[PDB]
Structures are given as structure tokens and as C-alpha cells.
């Protein structure tokens, strides 16, 4: 949707590949991409590098009274789309160990 044309979105790639993409870009703190979840069809994964380890955060869709939102914490922090989610965590950590600092591009 609003995320197809974003440099940090990589669609359907695997966990092993998102790691290899971030690795081939230096394992810098703050490197990230968002991908379609492999296990979960309607879900997404935020893959992020911190302290030279790649971490993976499940993004799940839900509904409040007919309105779709996404969340990484069981609805405790809700976002209308992935861009809102990504933009927020460029400024605020929330449940993440560090900010989304450098977009891992493709």
C-alpha cells in the first residue's frame, strides 16, 4: 500500500536474507528494513541491527471497530500503517533497543 514505494520496505524476503542484507551493509547500529512475514501471511517483520546482532520484531495487524491498525506489542502501541510505525521509531525507541537510524536500502 503506502509502503510499497519506501526504501526500507523489502516485501517477501526471508529472515536469513534480511540478515545478509544488513550484514552486507556493515552491522551498524540502527540499520533496518521491514519485510513480509514468512510464517504469517498478513504480518510484517521489522529487522533491526543493534550491538552487532540482528533482531526481528513481529508486526501484527488488528482491528478496532472496523479500523485496521498495526502493532508490535499486542495493541499497546498502534499505527495505521507501516510508514507511521517506521517514522515514529526513527525518533522514539518504544519497545526497541535503539532508534531506526539508517535505512537498509533496496
Amino acid at each position: 500500500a503506502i509502503h510499497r514505494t519506501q526504501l526500507w520496505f523489502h516485501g517477501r524476503i526471508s529472515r536469513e536474507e534480511s540478515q545478509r542484507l544488513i550484514g552486507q551493509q556493515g552491522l551498524v547500529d540502527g540499520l533496518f528494513l521491514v519485510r513480509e512475514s514468512q510464517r504469517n501471511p498478513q504480518g510484517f517483520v521489522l529487522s533491526l541491527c543493534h550491538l552487532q546482532k540482528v533482531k526481528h520484531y513481529l508486526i501484527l495487524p488488528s482491528e478496532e471497530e472496523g479500523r485496521l491498525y498495526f502493532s508490535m506489542d499486542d495493541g499497546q502501541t498502534r499505527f495505521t500503517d507501516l510508514l507511521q510505525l517506521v517514522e515514529f521509531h526513527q525518533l522514539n525507541r518504544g519497545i526497541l533497543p535503539c532508534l531506526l537510524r539508517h535505512c537498509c536500502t533496496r
Binding site: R39, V45, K55, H56, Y57, L58, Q76
Partner: peptide, 10 residues
């Protein structure tokens, strides 16, 4: 949490 995943929250 989500098994398989790093989400850490109350």
C-alpha cells in the same frame, strides 16, 4: 512475547 521473534513488552 512472540516466540520466534524479539518483541519485548509488558
Amino acid at each position: 512475547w512472540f516466540e520466534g521473534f524479539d518483541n519485548t513488552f509488558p
